[PDB]
Amino acid sequence: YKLICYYTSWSQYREGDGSCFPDAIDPFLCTHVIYSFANISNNEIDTWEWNDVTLYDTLNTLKNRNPKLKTLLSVGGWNFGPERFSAIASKTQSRRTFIKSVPPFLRTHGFDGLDLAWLYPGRRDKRHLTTLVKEMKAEFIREAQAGTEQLLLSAAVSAGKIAIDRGYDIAQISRHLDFISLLTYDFHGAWRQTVGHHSPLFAGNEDASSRFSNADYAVSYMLRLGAPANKLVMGIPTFGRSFTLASSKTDVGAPVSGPGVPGRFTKEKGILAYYEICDFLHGATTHRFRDQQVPYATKGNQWVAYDDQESVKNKARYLKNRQLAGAMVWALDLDDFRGTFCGQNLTFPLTSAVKDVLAEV
Ligand SMILES: *[C@@H]1O[C@H](CO)[C@@H](O[C@@H]2O[C@H](CO)[C@@H](O[C@@H]3O[C@H](CO[C@@]4(O)O[C@H](CO)[C@@H](O)[C@H](O)[C@@H]4O)[C@@H](O)[C@H](O[C@]4(O)O[C@H](CO)[C@@H](O)[C@H](O)[C@@H]4O)[C@@H]3O)[C@H](O)[C@H]2NC(C)=O)[C@H](O)[C@H]1NC(C)=O
């Protein structure tokens, strides 16, 4: 099984213990580690942060301890305008220029592949995305003639039915990608004025109309559309989504006023790292959706949807049962990487729980 793990560059800036650098990563935890995110300048792949060249080197030295470890550099991301990807892929000339700049950059910095994080292609982009993937892969095939191991090509893809139907030719890109990571943790949050879980595994016979907004539906749908199970990787989150309640009601459908209060370390309204959730739990009431198989907690007027060791193990078993290629984790820097916030002295408790299940078979 593959265990794909993302590391985000901006996590180096969090204060105190929240600060995470590539060397905090256990070389034997994941099979693949993806660095997020690279930029595109003058239609060529480029660094993003001032010290990326140094962090690339730090990350890639983990391979001196685990020679089987593979690293990839992810291009795009949320702070990368989707329109920007749009413009590059739409024109043969700018697309060729970008594709050509990739292999030498990857080789120079010691990466084993490129991850595409175009979030997200729209109806008018579907054809160009296919073109981008095909031609990128052909270039990688060509570059390997030089005697070096062929570069890997992956992509992070929406798990939302409407997003999938609108922007992706799944049957086509599946044949050119080495693996596809499903973003199965964005099924709510988004700004909708009700309380709900962003990463449920199953639909849950209760208050539903989404009926498409759960991991099981997304996986089934991808398989139906033509993606082979052996190229599909299921996304598992290591963060939680928070809400400020509008009333004293805590159960399903409870009214919400806006996102939750920022965490001390991550400092972003609406999100909390798992290590911050471990702290938040002291004094909170914990619950679990029996149908969706995911937990949530409340304290004061704060409501948090998250994943714990039990739900993450549950998701890992599910993907093994569907015979998928593996799991993807977003993100290592949001897991209890120091192993000092969540109690039982274990570094990366969530990611380790997934790895354990995956190693059972
Ligand atoms: C990821 O990559 C993107 C895309 O490459 C980076 O975005 C660009 O960032 C640069 C640096 O801040 C910046 O380019 C500069 O633009 C100057 C003028 O600004 C306009 O830029 O913006 C309006 C937009 O509507 C245009 O209509 C105008 O024509 C300009 O283009 C431009 O003057 C400046 O060019 C200087 O070139 O710099 C040289 C050398 O210092 C100087 O001698 C020249 O006289 C000149 O003034 C420069 O090119 C721009 O704002 C961003 N543009 C784009 C394409 O988005 C992004 O920074 C990067 N991200 C990260 C985090 O690295």
Task: Give me a quick take on this structure.
By secondary structure, the protein is α/β, with parallel strands linked by helices. It is built from 10 helices and 15 strands.
Bound compounds, each kind once, are: a molecule of 5 linked components (NAG-NAG-BMA-MAN-MAN)
**Beta-strand content estimate:** 15-25%
By helix and strand content, what is the structural category? alpha/beta
CATH class of the largest domain: Alpha Beta
CATH architecture of the largest domain: Alpha-Beta Barrel
**Spatial order of the strands in the main sheet?**
1-2-4-5-6-7-8-15
Largest beta-sheet characterization: 8 strands, parallel, barrel
Can you tell me the CATH topology of the largest domain?
TIM Barrel
State the CATH superfamily name of the largest domain.
Glycosidases
Please tally the helical runs, counting DSSP H or I stretches of 4 or more residues.
10
How many domain modules? 2
Order of helices and strands: EEEHEHHEHEHHEHEEEEHEEEHEH
User: Based on the structure, what is the oligomeric state of the protein chains?
Assistant: monomer
Radius of gyration: 20 Å
Subcellular location: Secreted, Extracellular space; Cytoplasm; Cytoplasm, Perinuclear region; Endoplasmic reticulum
Organism: Ovis aries (Sheep)
GO biological process, one term: inflammatory response
Subunit structure: Monomer.
